[PDB]
Design a protein around this ligand. Structure first.
Ligand SMILES: Cc1ncc(COP(=O)(O)O)c(C=O)c1O
Lengths: 224, 223
């Protein structure tokens, strides 16, 4: 597409340059072209991809929530807020559809490696859940099936290949829990998985993913 | 015209919404709408227009600076950093040229208070341009900011009070151009002086304080 002509190794360097200038909007683009090349990503690369898209899709859900609030506070004045909440909704739908078809068409590969397979399904997980945050109807139904199916198939492959300290499994756990609580209407399972996680982890504390457990606990506080 | 089929009032609520959502690309795009209805912009309105454009052209000026910085240290190689600097420089020039066209084609003989705010803008966006231009281009750009900031000065001088935040901030910016762009630090300094002065004849009649402490804050660095 818009980045076919560019050398792979240059895409990365520009990505990293974007990073510095904080043009995550472009950083994402660069990295997209990066992926489209067909070669597998390094660790350092995955993280750029991740970060660039985290940052874009992030501030999107941010202005959505800002707008979505101002849509409740307007339950006692004009359709303008609904439309502009719709426009932004679209944009986010769009970016998620992008990341989801990268993950699909390239990054989750046949055998792959164990450590990365998980990074990628965690990602599938989150991006189907950001869709869920704003989806509705039967559409919202089908989306949840997908985030679950994903987060799950990752859950399996991580605890059967990683130690409970590994910040990736902690992360994956953490979000799969947020998913249980916030999206799948299961505080029952969300509470119990945040706990099973924070416990088996606090145990083998002999990297520094103590920061992830601080999130796990922070959450469990609000849930009870 | 992507905004063209929306009613003016609506475009404005939508701007304000963008502001609240920190979505300045849109805020700006919305206002570009409002202004292309061909109808005078109110004070509160003129403020979203500059807030929006400032904010966009803001980060564009921040990145180019970041990226020039890298360009130097990394030739004091690979062309990647030059290329992408050029990418960003291009957007920048884009948005200025946009605003500069809004001003020229739609905003400029009104009332005095506003007729300045605009010539002040014309000047500011013509400088940001000159902040990146080169050769014969830069020359003609510099010449243009001078001309607008000037006409602005004249109108701010002939009919505004010396402590009016527009006549002030106008002078502020005109000074910064004098220093950083027209590479005449002489004239920069004895315009900062004159206005941190004719202003200081009234610290009695909270908002001007904000701007005045800048004319000095600047004069710190230029002396
Ligand atoms: C509202 C507003 N717009 C524009 C500017 C101009 O910015 P700079 O001095 O970096 O060119 C300023 C600052 O002086 C400002 O406060």
């Amino acid at each position: 597409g818009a980045m076919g002509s560019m050398e792979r190794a240059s895409l990365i360097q520009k990505a990293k340059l974007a990073e510095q200038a904080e043009r995550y909007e472009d950083m994402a683009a660069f990295m997209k072209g990066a992926v489209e090349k067909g070669e597998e990503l390094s660790c350092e690369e995955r993280n750029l991809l991740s970060v660039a898209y985290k940052n874009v899709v992030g501030g999107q859900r941010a202005a959505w929530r800002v707008l979505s609030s101002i849509e409740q506070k307007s339950n006692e004045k004009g359709p303008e807020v609904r439309e502009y909440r719709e426009k932004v909704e679209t944009e986010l739908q769009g970016v998620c559809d992008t990341v989801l078809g990268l993950l699909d068409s390239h990054l989750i590969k046949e055998a792959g490696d164990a450590e990365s397979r998980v990074f990628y399904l965690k990602m599938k997980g989150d991006y189907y859940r950001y869709l869920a945050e704003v989806a509705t109807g039967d559409d919202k139904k089908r989306i949840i099936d997908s985030a679950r199916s994903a987060y799950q198939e990752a859950m399996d492959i991580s605890k059967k290949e990683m130690p409970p300290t590994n910040p990736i499994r902690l992360g994956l756990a953490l979000n799969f829990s947020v998913f249980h609580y916030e999206i799948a209407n299961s505080p029952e399972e969300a509470i119990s998985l945040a706990k099973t996680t924070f416990d088996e982890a606090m145990a083998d504390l002999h990297k520094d993913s103590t920061l992830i457990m601080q999130l796990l606990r922070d959450n469990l506080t609000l849930w009870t």
